[PDB]
Enzyme design. Structure first.
Site, PDB file in Angstrom:
ATOM      1  N   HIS A 293     -53.770 -33.586 -74.790  1.00  0.00           N
ATOM      2  CA  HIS A 293     -54.861 -34.603 -74.344  1.00  0.00           C
ATOM      3  C   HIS A 293     -55.658 -34.436 -73.162  1.00  0.00           C
ATOM      4  O   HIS A 293     -56.510 -35.131 -72.908  1.00  0.00           O
ATOM      5  CB  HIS A 293     -54.070 -36.018 -74.452  1.00  0.00           C
ATOM      6  CG  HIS A 293     -53.451 -36.134 -75.517  1.00  0.00           C
ATOM      7  ND1 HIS A 293     -54.025 -36.725 -76.865  1.00  0.00           N
ATOM      8  CD2 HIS A 293     -52.348 -36.141 -76.011  1.00  0.00           C
ATOM      9  CE1 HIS A 293     -53.290 -36.998 -77.856  1.00  0.00           C
ATOM     10  NE2 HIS A 293     -51.981 -36.708 -77.300  1.00  0.00           N
TER      11      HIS A 293
ATOM     12  N   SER B 294     -49.437 -39.110 -74.044  1.00  0.00           N
ATOM     13  CA  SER B 294     -50.007 -39.722 -75.106  1.00  0.00           C
ATOM     14  C   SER B 294     -49.867 -41.168 -75.285  1.00  0.00           C
ATOM     15  O   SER B 294     -50.519 -41.985 -75.798  1.00  0.00           O
ATOM     16  CB  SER B 294     -49.594 -39.009 -76.429  1.00  0.00           C
ATOM     17  OG  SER B 294     -48.396 -38.685 -76.770  1.00  0.00           O
TER      18      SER B 294
ATOM     19  N   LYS C 230     -57.489 -32.008 -81.314  1.00  0.00           N
ATOM     20  CA  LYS C 230     -57.992 -33.076 -80.546  1.00  0.00           C
ATOM     21  C   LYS C 230     -59.493 -32.851 -80.150  1.00  0.00           C
ATOM     22  O   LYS C 230     -60.489 -33.372 -80.941  1.00  0.00           O
ATOM     23  CB  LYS C 230     -57.115 -33.540 -79.568  1.00  0.00           C
ATOM     24  CG  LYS C 230     -55.899 -33.701 -80.063  1.00  0.00           C
ATOM     25  CD  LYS C 230     -54.577 -34.111 -79.074  1.00  0.00           C
ATOM     26  CE  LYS C 230     -53.167 -33.981 -79.866  1.00  0.00           C
ATOM     27  NZ  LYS C 230     -52.962 -32.706 -80.197  1.00  0.00           N
TER      28      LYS C 230
END
Lengths: 392, 392
Positions: free
Chosen positions: A212, A184, A243
């Site tokens: 991610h 991240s 996300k």
């Protein structure tokens, strides 16, 4: 009693000074849906500090499925998955996710944070070891801290340091290597090929946190293992629904026997209420969309490539990113805060990375892309970032 | 690599044997909304193993507000509260909850589990101490384990052991006593009056976990401090939205300076996506209902009193409960599992408590009441429990 407690927090004055100077930009009250543009204090602000990579939180179909879920199942399950909190839809999501990442089984958790807490806390015991990339997400450090094993950190993406630290450990003891897929902070990718080679050389279990990566890299967004084609060398694939999947919750996928052990030994799933029906349907619909509509992942990467190039031409010092996370270095805590606030005042929302999270020379602002972003929005944001960087 | 990993889980065979014997009753797939009656495998089953004390998960108004939230805000915030995950409704809930428990400020967490992780991990440091009731919820043990302080456990509701262990600690060091308000296992209440007397005598901070107290005890369901009128002696009041409040998430309320410290230092709130808009609206509407409609709390206690009396007349050995959690002792792991499965087969859902969570002689089934339960349902459940206890 507040005596000694008052002393422990008395030293923390950074928030106090940030507010007094008019620089405070944490916990900003958004008044509208998370989108490429958000309303803050009645005014519109460009959102480049989101994790909604595919911009799906506003998709009317995902919203509809969530509303339907609530109509049929109510507002919550009022219990952990272990007891009364399991619904057929939870089970359905687990099998759909299993097929997605190419694993036998899966177990959901209420949050992505608790998804790391589970496996890291109960797999490796007393005389075992957990190997962590020094830049691993906080949930990974905490999860490892919850175990009764010895936690060893190794240099960021430093395979020599990994092999070196692994070779010092006793033959008769278990080891578990845990790493972020896409990190991240700088938006870089873990060197999975070499990490796995070192892993199966020492017979260490491998766990990858794809918070991610899902919906970003890998075939149809399947993740880091899929990206490198190393599905067979990754024992545990962990992911989040907060996300790309536009929801809340997480999961850990792997072999049936391991997941079954997790299901009945991980405290974060045994002693925590299950994810709401709305979020389960939400995640199911988003997953379906990510796979059946390639336009999103495609769109995300077109914006990422365009913005990255645009930034490099303007002279910005970008980090070694390989994802939609574009880290713009500033190298000054004060300046980083100032830039953030000034951009906020100019209608541009970006995330600051400062001390004590990283040394002052490694402080930066995280510029993040969403599939729904337009070339115009990107241009406007970058245009204002140049102006603000000038003023500083 | 799965070599050493396979060895660590190879010893766990209880689930395997439970399934083979046809006794397995964990993770039951419910196909309908959490209610007094739930559909499992097409058939109806009486639900007496829920945490939805006020039976609000099915309230059409709470469901409506959640659906409206989704329509306006989308499926998620895609970020932690720290950065891009804060909405005006999160802030509104925090101030409403603050007023509810009579405290200055409040900070929400994605789950009740993470609500304990936050304060317990960052308040007490290196040379400090955390005092835990040996029966504290798992999230409390884990949260304390996340701190860098020395964790000391004391006898269950044993004030002499509390004072004794506190008196051995150095004058110059901070202490934090953390306890469940109403303990989930036996359903008993913490001796807050004496605990707080001991606390402010040694200047120790006090934190109470009201997961099972909110919407159950205290004026209008305000909790344990409210119940004893000791609001002023409790530094931190923690609660969950997954039980009476029919949602998902939690919070920690206290003084403005302490909560502000929490907001910016607790990893579970800094590094975890915020609660979904649906759950925030859901919690807001439920809270409003709990306060403005006294019929629910009243109804809950009428069912609790009726069921408790009915059980005692049938000769059942109930634990020292003072809440809607009626622990029926069995004193045998095998029998406890057998009773659970047989009741499940007979359309009655109850929760088993066995080893290694408690010694075999302290094994029991948890019978829980909901405001929406009827005297008929209770009678039918107890009637079948007598029959099943006979067969065993």
């Amino acid at each position: 009693s507040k005596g000694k407690l008052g002393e422990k927090i008395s030293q923390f004055k950074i928030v106090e000074e940030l507010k007094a100077k008019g620089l405070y930009a944490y916990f900003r009250p958004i008044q509208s849906k998370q989108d490429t543009e958000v309303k803050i204090d009645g005014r519109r602000v460009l959102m480049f500090g989101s994790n909604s990579y595919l911009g799906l939180t506003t998709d009317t179909r995902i919203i509809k499925a969530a509303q339907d879920a609530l109509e049929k199942y109510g507002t919550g399950c009022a219990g952990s998955r272990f007891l009364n909190g399991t619904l057929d839809i939870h089970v359905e999501l687990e099998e759909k996710l299993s097929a997605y990442v190419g694993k036998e089984a899966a177990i959901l958790f209420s949050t992505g944070f608790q998804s790391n807490l589970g496996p890291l806390s109960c797999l490796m015991g007393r005389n075992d070891y957990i190997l962590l990339d020094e830049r691993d997400h906080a949930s990974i450090i905490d999860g490892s801290r919850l175990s009764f094993s010895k936690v060893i950190k190794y240099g960021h993406n430093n395979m020599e340091d990994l092999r070196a630290k692994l070779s010092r450990l006793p033959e008769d003891s278990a080891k578990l290597i845990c790493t972020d897929g896409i990190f991240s902070m700088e938006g870089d990718i873990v060197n999975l090929p070499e990490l796995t080679s070192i892993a199966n050389e020492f017979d260490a279990a491998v766990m990858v946190d794809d918070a991610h990566s899902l919906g970003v890299i890998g075939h149809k967004g399947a993740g880091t293992a899929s990206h490198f084609g190393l599905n067979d060398d990754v024992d545990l694939i962990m992911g989040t629904f907060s996300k790309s999947l536009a929801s809340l919750g997480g999961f850990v996928a792997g072999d049936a026997d391991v997941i079954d052990f997790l299901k009945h030994n991980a405290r974060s799933v045994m002693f925590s209420a299950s994810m709401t029906p709305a979020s389960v349907a939400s995640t199911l619909k988003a997953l379906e969309i990510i796979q059946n509509e390639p336009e999103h992942i495609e769109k995300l990467w077109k914006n990422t490539d365009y913005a990255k190039a645009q930034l490099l031409d303007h002279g910005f010092d970008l980090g070694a990113t390989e994802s939609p996370i574009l880290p713009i270095f500033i190298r000054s805590n004060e300046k980083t805060f100032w830039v953030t606030k000034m951009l906020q005042d100019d209608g541009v929302f970006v995330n600051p990375v400062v001390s004590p999270a990283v040394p002052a020379e490694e402080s930066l602002i995280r510029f993040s892309l969403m599939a729904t972003h337009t070339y115009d929005q990107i241009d406007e944001a970058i245009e204002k970032m140049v102006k603000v960087f000038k003023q500083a």
